[PDB]
Amino acid sequence: LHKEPATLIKAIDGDTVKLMYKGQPMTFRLLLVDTPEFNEKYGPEASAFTKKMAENAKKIEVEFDKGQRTDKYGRGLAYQYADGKMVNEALVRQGLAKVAYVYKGNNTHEQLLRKAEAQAKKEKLNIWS
Numbered sequence: 001l002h003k004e005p006a007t008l009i010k011a012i013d014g015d016t017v018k019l020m021y022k023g024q025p026m027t028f029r030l031l032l033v034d035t036p037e038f039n040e041k042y043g044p045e046a047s048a049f050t051k052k053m054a055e056n057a058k059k060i061e062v063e064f065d066k067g068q069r070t071d072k073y074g075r076g077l078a079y080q081y082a083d084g085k086m087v088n089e090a091l092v093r094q095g096l097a098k099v100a101y102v103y104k105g106n107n108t109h110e111q112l113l114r115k116a117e118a119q120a121k122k123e124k125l126n127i128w129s
């Protein structure tokens with residue numbers, strides 16, 4: 001897989017963000033994770049985390065997997081990086097997302113994220129407290 005450029009348009013919540021990709025505004029849904037909705041426990045904390053990571057980044061990138069690049073709602077499906085750090089993985093390591101929605105053929109980073117989830121669960125962080 002490879003990273004491609006994007007720029008931040010606006011934070012949305014823990015697992016969605018509005019980015020400009022190839023010069024067009026699009027909402028992205030982060031692959032392989034599920035954050036609580038804003039109205040649920042840890043939803044606001046997940047939103048704050050990804051808003052900070054994205055807004056402080058000098059360089060945002062997106063990486064598509066091998067499979068579907070948009071979902072049935074027209075959201076782009078990717079892994080998002082902020083100054084080289086994967087947001088998807090960071091959420092999971094902090095106990096602010098569960099590994100979820102693992103569909104065959106868009107699951108390249110599944111085991112990386114499961115290892116983060118195991119470390120978050122060991123530490124009893126956030127969702128795992």
Ligand SMILES: Cc1cn([C@H]2C[C@H](OP(=O)(O)O)[C@@H](COP(=O)(O)O)O2)c(=O)[nH]c1=O
Binds near residue numbers: 032
């Ligand atoms: C992460 C992801 C979600 N989706 C669809 C499955 C879920 O359908 P339903 O809306 O029918 O539940 C929805 C979950 O996203 P949200 O967690 O953003 O609500 O998005 C995909 O199709 N592919 C994906 O990789």
Ligand SMILES: [Ca+2]
Binds near residue numbers: 015037
């Ligand atoms: Ca969600």
